[PDB]
Design an enzyme around this catalytic site. Structure first.
Site, PDB file in Angstrom:
ATOM      1  N   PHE A 225       0.869  -1.172   0.000  1.00 47.43           N
ATOM      2  CA  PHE A 225       0.000   0.000   0.000  1.00 47.43           C
ATOM      3  C   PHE A 225       0.906   1.222   0.000  1.00 47.43           C
ATOM      4  O   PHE A 225       1.869   1.270   0.769  1.00 47.43           O
ATOM      5  CB  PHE A 225      -0.933  -0.007   1.211  1.00 47.43           C
ATOM      6  CG  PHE A 225      -2.096   0.949   1.103  1.00 47.43           C
ATOM      7  CD1 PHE A 225      -3.191   0.656   0.311  1.00 47.43           C
ATOM      8  CD2 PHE A 225      -2.102   2.124   1.821  1.00 47.43           C
ATOM      9  CE1 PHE A 225      -4.264   1.532   0.233  1.00 47.43           C
ATOM     10  CE2 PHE A 225      -3.170   3.003   1.745  1.00 47.43           C
ATOM     11  CZ  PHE A 225      -4.247   2.709   0.955  1.00 47.43           C
TER      12      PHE A 225
ATOM     13  N   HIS B  37       0.598   7.596   2.109  1.00 51.83           N
ATOM     14  CA  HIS B  37      -0.649   8.308   2.327  1.00 51.83           C
ATOM     15  C   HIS B  37      -0.580   8.960   3.700  1.00 51.83           C
ATOM     16  O   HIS B  37       0.225   8.575   4.553  1.00 51.83           O
ATOM     17  CB  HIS B  37      -1.858   7.365   2.247  1.00 51.83           C
ATOM     18  CG  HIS B  37      -1.851   6.331   3.323  1.00 51.83           C
ATOM     19  ND1 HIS B  37      -0.966   5.275   3.325  1.00 51.83           N
ATOM     20  CD2 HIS B  37      -2.568   6.225   4.466  1.00 51.83           C
ATOM     21  CE1 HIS B  37      -1.147   4.554   4.416  1.00 51.83           C
ATOM     22  NE2 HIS B  37      -2.112   5.111   5.127  1.00 51.83           N
TER      23      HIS B  37
ATOM     24  N   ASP C 195      -3.428   9.671   6.814  1.00 53.44           N
ATOM     25  CA  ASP C 195      -4.667   9.033   7.234  1.00 53.44           C
ATOM     26  C   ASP C 195      -5.845   9.992   7.166  1.00 53.44           C
ATOM     27  O   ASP C 195      -5.715  11.183   7.458  1.00 53.44           O
ATOM     28  CB  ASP C 195      -4.549   8.498   8.657  1.00 53.44           C
ATOM     29  CG  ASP C 195      -3.851   7.166   8.711  1.00 53.44           C
ATOM     30  OD1 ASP C 195      -3.422   6.684   7.638  1.00 53.44           O
ATOM     31  OD2 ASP C 195      -3.729   6.602   9.817  1.00 53.44           O
TER      32      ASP C 195
ATOM     33  N   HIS D  57       2.968   7.517   5.685  1.00 53.64           N
ATOM     34  CA  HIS D  57       3.457   6.169   5.917  1.00 53.64           C
ATOM     35  C   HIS D  57       2.989   5.281   4.775  1.00 53.64           C
ATOM     36  O   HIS D  57       2.124   5.653   3.979  1.00 53.64           O
ATOM     37  CB  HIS D  57       2.989   5.652   7.283  1.00 53.64           C
ATOM     38  CG  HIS D  57       1.514   5.766   7.487  1.00 53.64           C
ATOM     39  ND1 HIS D  57       0.881   6.973   7.697  1.00 53.64           N
ATOM     40  CD2 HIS D  57       0.541   4.826   7.490  1.00 53.64           C
ATOM     41  CE1 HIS D  57      -0.418   6.770   7.824  1.00 53.64           C
ATOM     42  NE2 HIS D  57      -0.650   5.475   7.711  1.00 53.64           N
TER      43      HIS D  57
HETATM   44  C1  LIG Z   1      -2.067   1.040   7.218  1.00 53.09           C
HETATM   45  C2  LIG Z   1      -3.203   0.214   7.799  1.00 53.09           C
HETATM   46  C3  LIG Z   1      -4.058   1.059   8.736  1.00 53.09           C
HETATM   47  C4  LIG Z   1      -4.047  -0.425   6.682  1.00 53.09           C
HETATM   48  N1  LIG Z   1      -4.469   0.564   5.708  1.00 53.09           N
HETATM   49  C5  LIG Z   1      -5.675   1.136   5.765  1.00 53.09           C
HETATM   50  O1  LIG Z   1      -6.544   0.789   6.563  1.00 53.09           O
HETATM   51  C6  LIG Z   1      -5.922   2.294   4.800  1.00 53.09           C
HETATM   52  C7  LIG Z   1      -4.825   3.329   5.018  1.00 53.09           C
HETATM   53  S1  LIG Z   1      -4.888   4.139   6.638  1.00 53.09           S
HETATM   54  N2  LIG Z   1      -7.226   2.885   5.055  1.00 53.09           N
HETATM   55  C8  LIG Z   1      -8.233   2.876   4.177  1.00 53.09           C
HETATM   56  O2  LIG Z   1      -8.178   2.278   3.103  1.00 53.09           O
HETATM   57  C9  LIG Z   1      -9.462   3.649   4.593  1.00 53.09           C
HETATM   58  C10 LIG Z   1     -10.607   2.746   5.044  1.00 53.09           C
HETATM   59  C11 LIG Z   1     -11.835   3.528   5.505  1.00 53.09           C
HETATM   60  C12 LIG Z   1     -13.068   2.625   5.733  1.00 53.09           C
HETATM   61  N3  LIG Z   1     -13.444   1.846   4.537  1.00 53.09           N
HETATM   62  C13 LIG Z   1     -14.251   3.470   6.184  1.00 53.09           C
HETATM   63  O3  LIG Z   1     -15.284   3.529   5.545  1.00 53.09           O
HETATM   64  O4  LIG Z   1     -14.029   4.120   7.282  1.00 53.09           O
HETATM   65  C14 LIG Z   1      -3.272  -1.523   5.976  1.00 53.09           C
HETATM   66  O5  LIG Z   1      -2.725  -2.382   6.792  1.00 53.09           O
HETATM   67  O6  LIG Z   1      -3.182  -1.571   4.766  1.00 53.09           O
HETATM   68 FE   LIG Z   2      -2.719   4.859   7.169  1.00 50.61          FE
END
Ligand SMILES: CC(C)[C@@H](NC(=O)[C@H](CS)NC(=O)CCC[C@H](N)C(=O)O)C(=O)O
Ligand SMILES: [Fe+3]
EC number: 1.21.3.1
Length: 328
Positions: A208, A211, A213, A267
């Site tokens: 990933f 980005h 948060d 991150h």
């Molecule tokens: C970095 C981690 C937190 C995780 N990534 C993630 O969770 C990534 C980046 S923070 N976050 C997202 O895609 C947003 C999800 C929001 C969710 N559908 C909602 O409706 O609230 C990973 O392990 O990939």
């Molecule tokens: Fe994140």
């Protein structure tokens, strides 16, 4: 190749009434937030062994039929009302990650924001109780467990910035919070699909990309496999894993409110071929929540930044993150 300084902070005083002890925790939160932006919360009181075990039982026992039945709109055109909550499918040979997202259990058909069809509010979908006994009960209880921890952490952030301890927490309420839990599975695969691996500018293989948060703060449990990196001026640094603690960082709403005094750290997730769990709780406020921005660097705290309603921030932020880093 270097390692990030991520302190382990005992947050237990934030649940208590020793005010000086709370201030000493706040100082450590401030220091971490002004350095790499990450810290581990320890002595948090949540049963993370049960969390990991019940999450694993779910991910490993759900079937393709059930995933279609729970799928969000991106994977199932029949589910036009599921943009956030539901199952995010993997695509064998192409996409490794899969996850299940759920929202405030208080969002029911009776809820006024649901009756009004307000964006970002949805009713959760759940698997069949007979196929996944006790899963929904566990997941709803966990939501309130981590809600409680997050409420305490928000008191620490408030004190760290020189505010009364309810400055953030007063906007973080069980009846309207837009906070979400995501239960993410990162699988072991052999061969690992090349399409699921992204190459960073610096050559690092990623799951990933970089980005900030979309959150006020992010409260993250992960199993014990190193994967996260944080960007500093001197390059990306590895965050060591700790499967007993919660990894905490600020999101971009905190950076906005504080005039970037607490930055939202950039991150990314390194590619690792290992079965693991990533279980974030995104601390979101209510749809109409507005916090007046301030600048802690100024004696008077004055800031020229516009107040931003949390609902508009969240709607735009979630779409932007999909556009930038892909449908998860
Ligand atoms: C970095 C981690 C937190 C995780 N990534 C993630 O969770 C990534 C980046 S923070 N976050 C997202 O895609 C947003 C999800 C929001 C969710 N559908 C909602 O409706 O609230 C990973 O392990 O990939
Ligand atoms: Fe994140």
């Amino acid at each position: 190749v270097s390692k990030a300084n991520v302190p382990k902070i005992d947050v237990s005083p934030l649940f208590g009434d020793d005010q000086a002890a709370k201030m000493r925790v706040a100082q450590q939160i401030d220091a971490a937030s002004r350095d790499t932006g990450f810290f581990y919360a320890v002595n948090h009181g949540i049963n993370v062994q049960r969390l990991s075990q019940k999450t694993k039982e779910f991910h490993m026992s759900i079937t393709p039929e059930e995933k279609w039945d729970l799928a969000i709109r991106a994977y199932n055109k029949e589910h036009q009302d599921q943009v956030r909550a539901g199952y995010y499918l993997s695509i064998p040979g192409k996409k490794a990650v899969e996850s299940f997202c759920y929202l405030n259990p208080n969002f029911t058909p009776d809820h006024p924001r649901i009756q009004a069809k307000t964006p970002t509010h949805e009713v959760n979908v759940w698997p069949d109780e007979t196929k996944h006994p006790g899963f929904q009960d566990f997941a709803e209880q966990y939501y309130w467990d981590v809600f409680g921890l997050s409420s305490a952490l928000l008191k620490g952030y408030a004190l760290a910035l020189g505010k009364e301890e309810n400055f953030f927490a007063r906007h973080f309420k069980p009846d309207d919070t837009l906070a979400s839990v995501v239960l993410i599975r990162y699988p072991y695969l052999d061969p690992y699909p090349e399409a699921a691996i992204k190459t960073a500018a610096d050559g690092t293989k990623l799951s990933f990309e970089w980005h900030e948060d979309v959150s006020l703060i992010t409260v993250l449990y992960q199993s014990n496999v190193q994967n996260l990196q944080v960007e500093t001026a001197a390059g990306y640094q590895d965050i060591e894993a700790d499967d007993t603690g919660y990894l905490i960082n600020c999101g971009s709403y905190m950076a906005h409110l504080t005039n970037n005094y607490y930055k939202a750290p950039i991150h990314r997730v390194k590619w690792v071929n290992a079965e693991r769990q990533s279980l974030p709780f995104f601390v979101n406020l209510g749809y109409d929540s507005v916090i007046d921005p301030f600048d802690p660097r100024e004696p008077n705290g004055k800031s020229d930044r516009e107040p931003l309603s949390y609902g508009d921030y969240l709607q735009n932020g979630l779409v932007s993150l999909i556009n930038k880093n892909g449908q998860t």
